[PDB]
Structure 1
Amino acid sequence: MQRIALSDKLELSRIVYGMWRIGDDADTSPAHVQAKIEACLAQGITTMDQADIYGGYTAEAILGGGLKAAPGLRDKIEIVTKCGIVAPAGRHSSARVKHYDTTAGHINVSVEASLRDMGTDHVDLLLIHRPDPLIDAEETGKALDALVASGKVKAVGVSNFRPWDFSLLQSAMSNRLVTNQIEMSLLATDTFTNGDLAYLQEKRVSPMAWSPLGGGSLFSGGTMAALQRIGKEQGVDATAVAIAWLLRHPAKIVPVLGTNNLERIRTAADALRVTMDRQTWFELYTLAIGKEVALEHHH
Structure 2
Amino acid sequence: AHHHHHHMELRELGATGLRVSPVGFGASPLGHVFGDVPRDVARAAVRRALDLGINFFDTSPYYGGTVSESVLGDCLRAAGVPRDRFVVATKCGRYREGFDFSAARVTRSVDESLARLGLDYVDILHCHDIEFTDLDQIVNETIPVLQKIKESGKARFIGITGLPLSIYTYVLDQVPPGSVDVILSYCHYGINDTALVDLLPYLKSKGVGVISASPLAMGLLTDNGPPEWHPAPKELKLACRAAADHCKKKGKNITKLAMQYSLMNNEISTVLVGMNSPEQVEENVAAAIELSTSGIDKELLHEVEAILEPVKNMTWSSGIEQA
Shorter-chain TM-score tier: 0.7 to 0.9
Q: Is residue 141–residue 169 contact of structure 1 (8 Å, CA) maintained in 2?
A: no
TM-score, normalised via structure 2 length: 0.70
Distance 1:249 1:84, change over 3 A: same
Larger relative contact order (Cα-Cα within 8 Å, sequence gap ≥ 6): 2
Aligned to 1:286: 306
Q: Is residue 231–residue 241 contact of structure 1 (8 Å, CA) maintained in 2?
A: no
Aligned to 2:13: 6
Distance 1:168 1:150, change over 3 A: farther
Deviation at 1:287, TM superposition (A): 1.6
SS in 1 for 2:218: coil
Aligned to 1:78: 87
Distance 1:84 1:197, change over 3 A: farther
Deviation at 1:54, TM superposition (A): 3.2
**What residue identity is the alignment partner of 2:244?**
M
Aligned counterparts of 1:39 and 1:8: Cα–Cα separation in 2: 29
Aligned to 1:199: 199
Distance 1:248 1:284, change over 3 A: farther
Point out where structure 2 has 5 or more consecutive residues left out of the alignment.
1-7, 225-240, 313-323
Q: 1:224 aligns with which of 237, 240, 244?
A: 244
**What residue identity is the alignment partner of 2:202?**
E
Deviation at 1:140, TM superposition (A): 1.5
Deviation at 1:201, TM superposition (A): 3.3
Aligned to 1:151: 153
Aligned counterparts of 1:64 and 1:37: Cα–Cα separation in 2: 10
Shifted more, 114-123 versus 238-247: the winner is: 238-247
Aligned to 2:39: 28
Deviation at 1:242, TM superposition (A): 0.8
Q: Is residue 34–residue 67 contact of structure 1 (8 Å, CA) maintained in 2?
A: no
Q: 1:182 aligns with which of 179, 186, 189?
A: 186
Aligned counterparts of 1:276 and 1:148: Cα–Cα separation in 2: 40
Aligned to 2:212: 209
Aligned counterparts of 1:113 and 1:231: Cα–Cα separation in 2: 47
Aligned to 2:109: 110
Point out where structure 1 has 5 or more consecutive residues left out of the alignment.
89-97, 293-299
Listed one character per residue, the Cα deviations across residues 155-206 of structure 1 (whole Å, up to 9, x for unaligned) are: 12211154543234333243343223221355751x52xxx54123332255
Aligned counterparts of 2:168 and 2:311: Cα–Cα separation in 1: 31
**What residue identity is the alignment partner of 1:254?**
T
TM-score, normalised via structure 1 length: 0.75
Identity of aligned residues (%): 24
Q: Is residue 248–residue 254 contact of structure 2 (8 Å, CA) maintained in 1?
A: yes
Q: Is residue 185–residue 209 contact of structure 1 (8 Å, CA) maintained in 2?
A: yes
**What residue identity is the alignment partner of 2:110?**
V
Q: Is residue 11–residue 266 contact of structure 2 (8 Å, CA) maintained in 1?
A: no
Aligned to 2:234: none
Aligned counterparts of 1:76 and 1:11: Cα–Cα separation in 2: 9
Q: CA RMSD in A?
A: 3.4
Aligned counterparts of 2:259 and 2:279: Cα–Cα separation in 1: 16
Aligned to 1:133: 133
Q: Is residue 125–residue 155 contact of structure 1 (8 Å, CA) maintained in 2?
A: yes
Distance 1:186 1:142, change over 3 A: closer
Q: Is residue 29–residue 64 contact of structure 2 (8 Å, CA) maintained in 1?
A: yes
SS in 1 for 2:215: coil
